[PDB]
Enzyme design. Structure first.
Site: not given
Ligand SMILES: [Ca+2]
Ligand SMILES: [Ca+2]
Ligand SMILES: [Ca+2]
Ligand SMILES: [Ca+2]
Lengths: 154, 152
Positions: A55, A65, A67
Site C-alpha cells: 500500500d 502494508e 491497515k
Molecule cells: Ca494491500
Molecule cells: Ca491494507
DNA sequence: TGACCAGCTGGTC
DNA sequence: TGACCAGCTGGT
C-alpha cells in the site's frame, strides 16, 4: 426528498475539497476502501501511496502494508478474507502500519516489523495445512498485540 | 504541508460523518458510507442494520449498489456468487447509483424481473461449473440504464 | 481470543 | 459484451 439533504449540499463543497486533497495524493475516491482514512495516515507519516499489493513506501524506498480499524466497533484488525500461504507470502516481506480510528477520527498509528508478525503468520500457516489446506476467513490481529508489539509512530 | 489543509477541512468532514451516523451509517469512509448516505437522502430511503440494505416507507426492502464510471462500467455484485446469494437477491428490487468520482450522476431501479436474466446465467454457470462460486460477476451500466427505471 | 460468519467494491483480458 | 483476477473490512 429527505430534508437533511440540504445540509449535505452545504457540506459537499468542503468534501469535494477533501477529495481534491486525496486526489493530489494518489487516492481517487475518499469513500472507497477507506480512502478518506488512508489519506490521514499518509499526511501524518509522510508516506506515499502505491497504485493491489503493498500500500505505501517511505522516502527511503521502504514499502508497507497499511491497515485500519474502528475501535468504536471492533478490536481485531482485519487481514484478508481468504488467508493462505500465498497471501502470507506477500505480507511477510514488509513491515506493517496499523492505524486506529474512533469512527473517522485518527487515534494512533503503530508500526510492526516482519519479526513482530511471524507469530501470526506461523499460526495461520499452521492452521492452513491442518484444516486441510482451507483458506482462513479473515483471521484478526488484536489491537492489544499491535499496541504492545509495534512502535507508536503517532 | 497538506496536513494543514486536511486539518482545516476536517470540521466539515466530521459533520458529514455526524450526519451519516444520524442516518444509520457507521463510517462514511467504510463500505462507501459517504456515498450510501447520498442515495438515502435523495431517494428518501432508510438503511437496514448484512443482506438487504434499505427499505422504503411502504416497507419494501432493497439491494443497493454503487459505481464510479470514471473507473469502471460494470456493477460488482458478490465476491462469492452462489445459488444462496442469488436466492436472496431474487427477493428484492435493486437500486443502482452511478457516480463520477464522488459526484452522484444518477440512480436507477431494477425489478427482480429485470435481473432474472443474470440470475439464471450465474446459477446455470454455478451448477454446470462444478459448483464453483463466481468471483464478482458484473452487471453492465448499459444494462442497468436500458432495463431500469431512472429514479434520479 | 480463535474461529467462524458476512459485508462494500475495482481491474482486465 | 463474460470470466476471470484482485482489494478494503465488520460481526459473533
Ligand atoms: Ca494491500
Ligand atoms: Ca491494507
Ligand atoms: Ca447487501
Ligand atoms: Ca448492496
Amino acid at each position: 426528498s429527505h430534508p437533511d439533504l440540504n445540509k449535505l449540499l452545504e457540506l459537499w463543497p468542503h468534501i469535494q475539497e477533501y477529495q481534491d486533497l486525496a486526489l493530489k495524493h494518489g487516492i481517487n475516491d475518499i469513500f472507497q476502501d477507506n480512502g478518506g482514512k488512508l489519506l490521514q495516515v499518509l499526511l501524518i507519516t509522510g508516506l506515499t501511496v502505491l497504485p493491489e499489493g503493498n500500500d505505501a513506501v517511505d522516502n527511503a524506498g521502504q514499502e508497507y502494508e497499511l491497515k485500519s480499524i474502528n475501535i468504536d466497533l471492533t478490536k481485531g484488525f482485519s487481514t484478508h478474507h481468504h488467508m493462505n500461504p500465498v497471501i502470507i507470502a506477500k505480507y511477510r516481506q514488509v513491515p506493517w502500519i496499523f492505524a486506529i480510528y474512533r469512527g473517522i477520527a485518527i487515534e494512533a498509528i503503530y508500526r510492526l516489523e516482519p519479526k513482530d508478525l511471524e507469530f501470526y503468520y506461523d499460526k495461520w500457516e499452521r492452521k492452513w495445512y491442518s484444516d486441510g489446506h482451507k483458506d482462513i476467513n479473515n483471521p484478526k490481529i488484536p489491537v492489544k498485540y499491535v499496541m504492545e508489539h509495534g512502535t507508536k509512530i503517532y
